[PDB]
Design a protein around this ligand. Structure first.
Ligand SMILES: Nc1ncnc2c1ncn2[C@@H]1O[C@H](COP(=O)(O)OP(=O)(O)O)[C@@H](O)[C@H]1O
Length: 403
């Protein structure tokens, strides 16, 4: 991921720039509740403008239209308005993102123009599949996917992807823009830079913190990271499958993966061959049901979790052992929380861990959190950086130009 063209190396003087951005801002009744994403794209836009771009055409998606036009539910129009204010420059909103009219509008704009197109996911051709009003799944048509892609391509002379968080999908706006230079925007640059260091030449010790719910769909994540790390914390719902299998721990109604259980000793067996020191939790915050407002308890591996109750967070002794690993690390990658941090009662392990990760950063650790000024890098894509850590090829990253 080191050798990708980035916007700062791209010539844009007098060029029309088609820029895929992340403008999926949280919305309430069509009013933007957090403009943080729009803000994050401004440096890229401005760089283009300050460097004499003829136009920047912004294409993005919002919400969940699933390939049906929903102008009154998932329009990008409000975003154009916020952007005009963020930039101090007019932004031209277009009511579609492809077709003859949009093409004429973009063919030779007034120099310095900024254009936001309507939501890409109004077209089944963006994602290559969608639904209808009755919610019956539909397929896109090959011929029409290709035409969509040719129309997006008509809108600029160079292309910028600053949408890392979509870069794991082979979508028209990710892989379909056929233009001679395809660069990463400034957000995408930071992602490639941080993840490339971590995967290629991490500082050492390299600690991976892996949490979340399910073991089953994290087998490649763990496997690949076992090729690379020196230490790994296993937390979140995952840990109960490991502790049941490895230690015969009573887990109560804690998440258990019957399929995952059968490979636990396989993974530990790989950790051992490789010299990766595994830190599992040793105590827990328990809950009488899966609910924000459940009664809370405490349990250790020795006592086990009681009948009826589940571990939704690690305890104080687990936080210390976690901290011991964090204290050793010179490079940390963290993917997935270590308890149900959405619920205040089950959020202490995660907050405490984050406090340790923040101090580590102060002392000079390189710290990467998956999908904020106190860590080295917060990733802008959750699914994408997970597939990265799995060692997969990301279509939108792979499509960018080399050198
Ligand atoms: N001990 C636990 N038991 C059940 N769920 C948990 C536990 N710890 C964390 N989780 C939940 O798992 C979710 C993250 O799981 P993950 O596999 O990363 O799914 P996602 O696909 O949402 O990222 C979080 O929302 C968190 O609340």
């Amino acid at each position: 991921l080191s050798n990708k063209l980035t916007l700062d190396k791209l010539d844009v003087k007098g060029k029309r720039v088609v820029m895929r951005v992340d403008f999926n801002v949280p919305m309430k009744n069509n009013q933007i509740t957090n403009n943080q994403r729009i803000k994050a794209a401004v440096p890229s836009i401005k760089f283009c403008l300050d460097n004499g771009a003829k136009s920047v055409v912004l294409m993005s998606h919002l919400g969940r239209p699933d390939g049906v036009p929903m102008p009154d539910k998932y329009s990008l129009e409000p975003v154009a308005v916020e952007l005009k204010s963020l930039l101090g420059k007019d932004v031209l909103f277009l009511k579609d993102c492809v077709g003859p009219e949009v093409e004429k509008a973009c063919a030779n704009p007034a120099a310095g123009s900024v254009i936001l197109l309507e939501n890409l996911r109004f077209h089944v051709e963006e994602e290559g599949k969608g639904k209808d009003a009755s919610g019956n799944k539909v397929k896109a048509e090959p011929a029409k996917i290709e035409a969509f892609r040719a129309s997006l391509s008509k809108l600029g002379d160079v292309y910028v992807n600053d949408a890392f968080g979509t870069a794991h999908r082979a979508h028209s706006s990710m892989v379909g823009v056929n233009l001679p230079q395809k660069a990463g925007g400034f957000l995408m640059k930071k992602e490639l830079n941080y993840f490339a260091k971590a995967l290629e030449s991490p500082e050492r010790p390299f600690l991976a913190i892996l949490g979340g719910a399910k073991v089953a769909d994290k087998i490649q994540l763990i496997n690949n990271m076992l090729d690379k790390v020196n230490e790994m914390i296993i937390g979140g719902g995952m840990a109960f499958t490991f502790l049941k299998v490895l230690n015969n721990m009573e887990i109560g109604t804690s998440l258990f993966d019957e399929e995952g259980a059968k490979i636990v000793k396989d993974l530990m067996s790989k950790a051992e061959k490789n010299g990766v020191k595994i830190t599992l939790p040793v105590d827990f915050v328990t809950a009488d049901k899966f609910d924000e407002n459940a009664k809370t308890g405490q349990a250790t591996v020795a006592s086990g979790i009681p009948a009826g109750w589940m571990g939704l967070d690690c305890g104080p002794e687990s936080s210390k052992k976690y901290a011991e690993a964090v204290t050793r690390a010179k490079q940390i990658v963290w993917n997935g929380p270590v308890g149900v941090f959405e619920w205040e009662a089950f959020a202490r392990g995660t907050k405490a861990l984050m406090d340790e990760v923040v101090k580590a950063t102060s002392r000079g650790c390189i710290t990467i959190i998956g999908g904020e000024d106190k860590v080295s890098h917060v990733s802008t894509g959750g699914g994408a950086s997970l597939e990265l850590l799995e060692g997969k090829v990301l279509p939108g990253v792979d499509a960018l130009s080399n050198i």
